[PDB]
Amino acid sequence: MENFQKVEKIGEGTYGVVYKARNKLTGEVVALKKIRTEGVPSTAIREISLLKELNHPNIVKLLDVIHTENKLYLVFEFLHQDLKKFMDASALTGIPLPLIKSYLFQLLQGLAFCHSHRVLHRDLKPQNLLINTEGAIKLADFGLARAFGVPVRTYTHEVVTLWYRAPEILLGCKYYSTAVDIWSLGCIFAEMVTRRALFPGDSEIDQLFRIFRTLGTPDEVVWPGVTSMPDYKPSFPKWARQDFSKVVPPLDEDGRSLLSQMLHYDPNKRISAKAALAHPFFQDVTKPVPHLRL
């Protein structure tokens, strides 16, 4: 705007443009997010203003929420790399399990905190997870779908990723549950392990059918009420669930068990972030430091 000398465009947020900027008056480097118009709900945004009070080591600190010119500016502490770039960087050898384990454990702590404060992220994806040289990983973005929602793209015609979207969202559920974040983190967990997106759908139905072909088409047995969902069709194909051992090798049984619980069809059966933190997969969790190329 003026108190900020844009350094580089960090990228394209699903609400606007994110810039790496420097506070010309404080000298601190931050991530500046400019929001997409004709006023925007001032009562809805209050949520955001409440997010400044959500302080946790695994959540990106929201330093400021500014309203001026129908442009909403969000100032976040700046982190040097997102998880997608890091995974791509490690694609050849894979992220080491101890690090995968540490990031998973930290993201769960972050989610446990948000969920206990009644905040849902709703759009977890590798690109929204930020890491530093210290070995920490933080939740960035946060949907803010109740105070904003999901556009016909993001802010300027851009292919929204559906890969980490929970089945109840794909089936037209209106009320989000904190369980949707768990599903997404589960997908991200499998992705770090295998170095392949778990459910790479390029359309809502393709996304849904990819989930079904892998976990089996859900029914009233495994998911009471599923046939009552808004977009459920009795015409959906009936795929048998695939053996889970083929889904995430060579993840051990502790990891597979935790993953199956994070990917339970029924949201009420899906494990919470708090219980997952107590899962035996984390008995030997540590905090390695990643090899970061900045």
Ligand X SMILES: Nc1nc(Nc2ccc(S(N)(=O)=O)cc2)sc1C(=O)Nc1c(F)cccc1F
Percentages of the chain per state (helix, strand, coil), in multiples of 5 = 30, 15, 50
The one segment of 80-88, 108-116, 183-191, 215-223 that binds ligand X by CB under 6 A: 80-88
Cβ proximity to ligand X, 140 vs 259, nearer residue? 140
Q: Does 191 bind ligand X (CB under 6 A)?
A: no
Residue of 78, 105, 148, 209 that binds ligand X (CB under 6 A): 78
Choose the catalytic residue: 64, 88, 123, 254. Answer: 123
Ranges within 27-46 binding ligand X (CB under 6 A):
31, 33
Task: Out of 22, 80, 274, 287, point to the residue binding ligand X (CB under 6 A).
Answer: 80
Length of the chain: 294
Residue 154: CB atoms within 10 A of its CB come to: 17
- The span of 46-54, 69-77, 97-105, 252-260 binding ligand X (CB under 6 A) equals 69-77
Residue 128 assigned ligand-binding role = yes
> What CA–CA distance (Å, rounded) separates 195 from 84?
11
- SS3 label, residue 92: coil
**Sequential DSSP letters for 138-168:** EE-----TTTT---SSSSSS-----TT--HH
List the beta bridge partners of residue 35.
Answer: 16
Residue with tokens 């209050």: 46
The values of phi and psi at residue 116, to 5°, are -75, -20
Q: Which of 79, 87, 108, 190 binds ligand X (CB under 6 A)?
A: 79
Residue 81 binds to ligand X (criterion: CB under 6 A): yes
Closest to ligand X by CB, 3 vs 268, is 3
Interacting residues toward ligand X by CB under 6 A? 10-11, 13, 18, 31, 33, 60, 74, 76-82, 85, 128, 130, 140-141
Query: Annotated binding site for ATP: which residue ranges?
Result: 10-18, 33, 77-79, 82, 125-128, 141
